[PDB]
Structure formats: C-alpha cells, structure tokens
Structure 1
Amino acid sequence: MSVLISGASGYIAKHIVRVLLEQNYKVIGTVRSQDKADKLLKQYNNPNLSYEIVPEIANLDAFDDIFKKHGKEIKYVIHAASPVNFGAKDLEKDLVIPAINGTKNMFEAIKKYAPDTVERVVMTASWASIMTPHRQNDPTLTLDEETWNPVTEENAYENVFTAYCASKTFAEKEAWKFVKENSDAVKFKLTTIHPSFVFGPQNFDEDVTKKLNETCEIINGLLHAPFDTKVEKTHFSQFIDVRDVAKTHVLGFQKDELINQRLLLCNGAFSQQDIVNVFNEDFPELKGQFPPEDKDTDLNKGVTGCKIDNEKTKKLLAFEFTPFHKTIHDTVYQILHKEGRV
C-alpha cells in the first residue's frame, strides 16, 4: 500500500506528501540528490517516509531502479515531476524533453516491473494542457475537461511560457496514449490533475526563501517590489490553492469516480493588481512597503478571460475550493511572519 511520488522536493509535492502522511500512507518520494533527501527527511521527521534518488527524469529508464527495489509494495503512483522554469534558455532540453520522457519513463517502469501491482497513477498535468495560452484573456473560449491545448510541436516554442505549456500538453498526450495501447497488459487506471497558477503557503515555513518556486514568486516579487513599480491591472490568469491541489491528488487514487478523469482545478481570475490589493487591504500597517491599491482591475469590471466550465470536476471532488483572497492572504502572511514583520 505504499505510494510513490516523483519530484517530491517541489512546492506542490511537499504538500501532497504532508497529506499522504496525515493519512498514514507509507510514502516513497523521488528527489534529485541525497542532500535534498536528507534535508527533507529532517523536515518531516516521519518514519513512514523514504526517498529514492532520481537525478534526471529525462534519462533512460529513469524510474526502473525504484521499481526493481520497491515494485512489490507500490500500489499507487503520483507522477508530479516536471520542470516549471520560465527562465529556461534551452526550451527543448530544459522543458519539453524532461516532461515527456519523465512520463514515458514512469509508465514503462510500471509496465515492466509491476504491471499487475500498481493500481492507480495520478499525474500532475496542468490546465496548460486544456487552455490556449494566447486565449487566456478571450471570453469567447469556454474550457472544460475535454478541451485540449491545440499547440503543435511546430508552434510550441513561441516563448518560454508556450513551451512550458506544450511540455505539459505533450506529456499528457503520451500518458493517455500509453493507457490506450496497454489497456490489457497494465492494470493501473490513470487520473490527471490540471491546476492553473498555484498559490498558497509553502508546506514548511523554513522554505520561505528570497526567491520562491516560479508561481509563488509572482506573489513574493510583487510583495517586495518598490512602491513605484508599475503593476498590471489587466486579466492575467486563473489560480488555485496549493492545498486544494494536494488534496485532489490523494483523492485521485482513492475514489473510483476519478478513474479516467481529467480534473480542471481553477477557482478564480486575477491580475497582478488583485494580488497587490490583498496586501494593502489585509496588512494596512505596511502600506508604502509595497505597491499601492487600485480597484480598477479587469476582475472588478467583470472581465475574467476565458470561461471555466469545471462543474464536472467540482461535482466529482465534492469539496469546496479555497477562495482567492484567503490563498493570497495565507501566502503573504507566511512570508511576512517569517521575516518578522507581522
């Protein structure tokens, strides 16, 4: 009944591991180095947690050694390892190949060493494999769980963000293709999770560093920006709270209703300024130490970009998502409190 989770040192994954340990699962995480594993073991201080070292998911048969050692005990797999790096300079090598090869490697390791043992795979995809990046602000587009990013390999590399979104799209397509072609040989059922921009506190306060993971660095950077910084007030994207994401991944292997589902995790539109507005409203004593409030945002004019039809997802998951104001508040509070400022 052990649970394998790839890329276990990341922002989302550390919350998933917390949830797994709350529920008394035996957890095997993969991280890139023994230093990372050692630090994490001390953070959780939980005998049910172990780490195996997978230094590069893109490399040949990267997950075979794990299934050689642990094949018999791994009943569930959470495939969360994929690069989220909008500073990548080599878009093929740093984003697209690791996303795809990581996914192929995990599924082929399962097929070779535990085709009848692994019951469920929950894969972290993204809403990036559902939405169209240049239409995030297009109210004529309605997304649902059957919508696909139409990006092709030919136009994937327009910029770093389209390339990231393509890595997620192409990886997920390979996931469903594998499932299609191996229906009778491998018993696992797949569930894919599709978060939008993930905000919320780091799982451990000590992990609040000068620069955070890419998506929370949006908030962290605005929070530390000079008062005179120009902040955009036009619609940016959809968000979801990291704690909702983590909860969904664990439900993903537990609930039969989630078999063969793509789950679209969005809970609200925002601009940069809507984030800043939370700083000023909730920490008024620090006004002037970050950019100012301005209520003239796209959101407040009823402008939210592409439409999100995730009713099926919400009905399947049943639990209520965390609202934007709380997600931002909790992110900001953790940072300011760590800094000894509130």
Structure 2
Amino acid sequence: MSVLISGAYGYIAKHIVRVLLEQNYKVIGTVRSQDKADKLLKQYNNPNLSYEIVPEIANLDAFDDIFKKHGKEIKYVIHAASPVNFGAKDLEKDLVIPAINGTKNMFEAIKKYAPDTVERVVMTASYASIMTPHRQNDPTLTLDEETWNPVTEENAYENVKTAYCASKTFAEKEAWKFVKENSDAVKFKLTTIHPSFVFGPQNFDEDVTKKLNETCEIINGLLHAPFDTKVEKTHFSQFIDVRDVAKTHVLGFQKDELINQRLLLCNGAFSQQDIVNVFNEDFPELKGQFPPEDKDTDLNKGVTGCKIDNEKTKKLLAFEFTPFHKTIHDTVYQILHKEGRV
C-alpha cells in the first residue's frame, strides 16, 4: 500500500505529499539530489516519508532502480515530474525531451519490474494539453475533457509558450498510447489531471523565497513590483488553487469512478490587474507599495476568453473548488506575513 510520487520537491507535489500523509499513506517521493532529499524530510518530519534519488528523468531507464528496490510495495503512482521553465533556451532539451522520456521511463519501469502490482497511475498532464494556446482569447471555442491541443511536432517550437504546452501534450499522448498498446500486459489504470495556472500558498512557509516557482512568481513579482508598472488588464488565462489540485491527485487513485478520465481543473478567468486588485482590496493599509487598483478589467466587463466545460470533472470530483479571491489572498498573505509586513 505505498505511493510513489515523482518530482516531490515541486510546488504542487509538496501539497500532494501533505495530503497523502494526512491520510496515513506511506509515501516515496523522488528528488533530484540528496541535498533536497534531506531538506524535505526535516520539513515533513514524518516516519512514513522515504526518498529515492532520480537526478534526471530523461536519462536511460531513470526509474528502474526504484522498482527493483520498492517493487512489491508500490500500489499507486503519482507521476508529477515535468519541467516548468518559462525562460528555457534549449526548448527540445529543456522541456520536450524530459516531459516525454520521463513519462516513458516511468511507464516502462512499471512494465518491467511491477506489471501486476501497480494498481493506479495519476499523471499531472495540463490545461496546456487541452487548450489551444493562441485561441485563449476566443470565446467561440469551448474546452472540455475530450479536447486536445492540436499542436504538431513541426509548429510546436514557435516560441517558449507553444513549446512547454506541446511538451505537456506529447507526453500525454505517449501515456495513453502506452496504455492502449499494453492494456493486456500491465494492470494499472491511468488517470490524467489538467490544471490551469496553479496559484496558492507554498506548502511550507520557509519556501517563500525571493523568487518562487514559475506560476506563483507571477503573483510574487506583481506584489513587489514598483508602483507605476504597466499591469495587463486584458484576459490572460484560467487558474486553479493548488490545494484543489493536491486533493484531486489523491482522489485520482482512490475513487473507481476516476479511471480513464482526463480531469480538467479550471475555476476562473483572470487578468494581471484582477490579481493586483486583491492586493489593494484585502490589504488596504499597504496602498502605494505595489501597483494600484483598477476595476475596468476584462473579467468585470464579463470577458473570460474561451469557455470551460468542466462539468463532468466537477461532478466526478464532488468537492467545491476554491474561489479566486481566496487563492490570491492566501498566496499573498503568506508572503507578506513571512516578510513581516502584516
């Protein structure tokens, strides 16, 4: 009854671990270095948490050692290890190759040393593998759990955005491809999770550094921005609270009803200005120390870009997602409070 979570130092994966432990599960995280396999254990301070070193997921057979060792004992797997880099220079090396090869390694590992044992896999695909990047501002497009990013190998490296989305997309295709080809040879049942822009507070207060993980850095940067910086008030994308994501991943391997599902996690359209208004609304005493409040935003006009039909998702999961106002507030409070401003 053990749970392997890959990429366990991750913003999201650290909430997943929190939840796994809350429910008294034996967790095996994977991390890049020993440096980090130490930092985490001290934070969690839990006898059920163990770690295995996987420095590079793209490398040959990257997960085979974990399954020689802990082979008999891993029943559920949460593959959450994929690169997230918005400034990546080597697009194939930095994004696509690890996304794909990391996933083939994880899966081919489960084929080789634990075909019969591993009951469930929960993969962290993305809103990126469902949306059409360049058509986010097109309200005639509706996205649901059967929608795919039509990006092809040939036009995927247009820029860094189209690259990291393609990476999530192609990795996913490989997963499903795998499942269909080997459904007779391996027992596990795949479930993929598709979060949009994940915001929310860092699982540990100490992890509030000068520069956060990629998506929360959006908020962090804005909060420390000089007063008269230009803030984009046009619609940007969808969000979903990290806490909602965590819960969802664990449910992923628990509930029978979530087998073979693509779970689409959005809960609100937002702009940069819409985030900045939460600064000014919830912490009025700090007016002047970040950009100002402006209501005329695409959100308040009623402009939300493309439509999200995630009703099947919401029904299946059962729980209510966290409102934007809460998610931004909690993210912000944690930082300002760590800094001693409130």
* Shift, 1:306, TM fit: 0.5
- Name the CA distance, whole Å, in 2 between partners of 1:12 and 1:155: 29
- Name the CA distance, whole Å, in 1 between partners of 2:70 and 2:301: 54
* Shift, 1:314, TM fit: 0.3
- Name the CA distance, whole Å, in 1 between partners of 2:307 and 2:61: 39
* Shift, 1:163, TM fit: 0.2
- Name the CA distance, whole Å, in 2 between partners of 1:13 and 1:42: 16
Moved over 3 A (4+): none
* Shift, 1:8, TM fit: 0.2
* Shift, 1:112, TM fit: 0.3
* Shift, 1:304, TM fit: 0.2
- Name the CA distance, whole Å, in 1 between partners of 2:31 and 2:161: 25
- Name the CA distance, whole Å, in 2 between partners of 1:137 and 1:5: 35
Deviation by residue 1:67-98 (Cα, 9 ceiling, x = unmatched): 00001000000000000101100000000000
Deviation by residue 1:87-142 (Cα, 9 ceiling, x = unmatched): 10000000000000010000000000000000000000001000000011110100
SS across alignment from 1:4: strand
| Length-normalised TM-score, structure 1 | 1.00
- Name the CA distance, whole Å, in 1 between partners of 2:71 and 2:141: 43
SS across alignment from 1:294: coil
Residue 325 (structure 1) aligns with: 325
* Shift, 1:313, TM fit: 0.2
Deviation by residue 1:10-35 (Cα, 9 ceiling, x = unmatched): 10000000000000000000000000
Deviation by residue 1:251-276 (Cα, 9 ceiling, x = unmatched): 00000000000000000000000000
Residue 33 (structure 2) aligns with: 33
- Name the CA distance, whole Å, in 1 between partners of 2:70 and 2:184: 23
- Name the CA distance, whole Å, in 2 between partners of 1:186 and 1:119: 9
- Name the CA distance, whole Å, in 2 between partners of 1:14 and 1:331: 15
| Length-normalised TM-score, structure 2 | 1.00
* Shift, 1:230, TM fit: 0.4
**What is the Cα-based RMSD across aligned positions, in Å?**
0.3
* Shift, 1:60, TM fit: 0.4
Residue 170 (structure 2) aligns with: 170
* Shift, 1:250, TM fit: 0.1
SS across alignment from 2:277: helix
- Name the CA distance, whole Å, in 1 between partners of 2:196 and 2:72: 35
SS across alignment from 1:225: coil
SS across alignment from 2:154: coil
Residue 244 (structure 1) aligns with: 244
Matches within 5 A, 1:1-342: 1-342=1-342
- Name the CA distance, whole Å, in 2 between partners of 1:222 and 1:129: 27
SS across alignment from 1:331: helix
- Name the CA distance, whole Å, in 1 between partners of 2:305 and 2:90: 30
* Shift, 1:239, TM fit: 0.1
Deviation by residue 1:206-257 (Cα, 9 ceiling, x = unmatched): 0000000000000000000000100000000000000000000000000000
Deviation by residue 1:305-334 (Cα, 9 ceiling, x = unmatched): 000000000000000000000000000000
Deviation by residue 1:265-314 (Cα, 9 ceiling, x = unmatched): 00000000000000000000000000000000000111000000000000
For structure 1, the residue ranges without an aligned partner over 5 or more in a row are none
SS across alignment from 1:154: helix
SS across alignment from 1:249: helix
Deviation by residue 1:163-220 (Cα, 9 ceiling, x = unmatched): 0000000000000000000000000000000000000000000000000000000000
- Name the CA distance, whole Å, in 2 between partners of 1:15 and 1:126: 17
* Shift, 1:6, TM fit: 0.3
* Shift, 1:47, TM fit: 0.2
* Shift, 1:38, TM fit: 0.2
Deviation by residue 1:31-75 (Cα, 9 ceiling, x = unmatched): 000000000000000000011000000000100000000010000
- Name the CA distance, whole Å, in 1 between partners of 2:137 and 2:238: 10
* Count of paired positions: 342
For structure 2, the residue ranges without an aligned partner over 5 or more in a row are none
Moved more, 154-163 or 232-241: 154-163
- Name the CA distance, whole Å, in 1 between partners of 2:199 and 2:61: 32
* Shift, 1:149, TM fit: 0.2
